[PDB]
Amino acid sequence: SWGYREHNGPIHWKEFFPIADGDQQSPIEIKTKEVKYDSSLRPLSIKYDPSSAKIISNSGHSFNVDFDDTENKSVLRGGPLTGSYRLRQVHLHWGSADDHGSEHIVDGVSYAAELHVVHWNSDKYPSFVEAAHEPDGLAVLGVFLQIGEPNSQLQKITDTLDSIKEKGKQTRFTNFDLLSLLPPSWDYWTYPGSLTVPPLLESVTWIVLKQPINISSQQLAKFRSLLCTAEGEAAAFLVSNHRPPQPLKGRKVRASFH
Numbered sequence: 001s002w003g004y005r006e007h008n009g010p011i012h013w014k015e016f017f018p019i020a021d022g023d024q025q026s027p028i029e030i031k032t033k034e035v036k037y038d039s040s041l042r043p044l045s046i047k048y049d050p051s052s053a054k055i056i057s058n059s060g061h062s063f064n065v066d067f068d069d070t071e072n073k074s075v076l077r078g079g080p081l082t083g084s085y086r087l088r089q090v091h092l093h094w095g096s097a098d099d100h101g102s103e104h105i106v107d108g109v110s111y112a113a114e115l116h117v118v119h120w121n122s123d124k125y126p127s128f129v130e131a132a133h134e135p136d137g138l139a140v141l142g143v144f145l146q147i148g149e150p151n152s153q154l155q156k157i158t159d160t161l162d163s164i165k166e167k168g169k170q171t172r173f174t175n176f177d178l179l180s181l182l183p184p185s186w187d188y189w190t191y192p193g194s195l196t197v198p199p200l201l202e203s204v205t206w207i208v209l210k211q212p213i214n215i216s217s218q219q220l221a222k223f224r225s226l227l228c229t230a231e232g233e234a235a236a237f238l239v240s241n242h243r244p245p246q247p248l249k250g251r252k253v254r255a256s257f258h
């Protein structure tokens with residue numbers, strides 16, 4: 001099945017999920033001189049309840065923090081979006097070296113990692129699974145991580161990783177103050193695109209913050225110790241899990257700021 005190893009990695013996904021070569025694939029290169037400032041874009045309106053986080057698990061492809069998305073306690077609005085997008089999950093992408101770990105790349109700069117906060121349009125769709133197959137279904141906030149001071153909220157995640165080393169393991173995880181994790185400035189770029197993992201559905205309104213947050217090199221390194229293999233199987237480590245940038249194919253990247 002798919003992954004980030006030689007035989008099953010990003011270059012091979014198109015062999016078995018053909019939309020990998022679609023017209024609205026993510027991530028992308030963000031070229032700040034080509035982006036269009038758009039005065040119609042709104043500031044982000046962010047409400048994240050720390051009690052929404054419930055579980056952290058190892059998917060084999062990243063960790064995911066799952067949020068109880070039963071009602072509208074944690075929602076994203078404003079920005080480019082019409083309507084209210086409910087928080088579902090958070091995960092991270094990184095590389096084998098701090099030099100190059102993000103998925104979006106800004107004028108050639110790859111950051112050490114990139115956080116994705118995944119939301120779905122509950123004003124139009126009845127569930128995440130239905131939302132995930134519609135162009136206006138999902139909204140993902142991407143946040144870059146650069147190496148710097150340890151991050152006290154991220155420490156809560158790294159303290160759990162020993163318990164979820166094997167693919168499929170889960171453990172409880174709550175009181176995660178995602179709002180406080182975000183960087184001081186919420187100025188962003190936005191474009192229409194896709195999931196960056198199979199099934200690569202073109203259902204995502206991407207909202208990429210310009211300002212990175214910090215993580216220490218030691219905290220970042222703990223993520224590379226997760227396994228992409230299940231309990232009792234030949235161990236392989238998830239040292240890298242980012243997809244390369246995909247062709248822009250004439251999409252408009254807009255800026256909320258100039």
Ligand SMILES: NS(=O)(=O)c1ccc(C(=O)Cn2cnc3ccccc32)cc1Cl
Nearest residue numbers: 116118129132138140194195196197204
């Ligand atoms: N890396 S990404 O941030 O673009 C992303 C990565 C994963 C997912 C998922 O929710 C994966 N997933 C897990 N179960 C799914 C059912 C339907 C559609 C997608 C499903 C969503 C997203 Cl938006």
Ligand SMILES: [Zn+2]
Nearest residue numbers: 091093116196
């Ligand atoms: Zn992602």
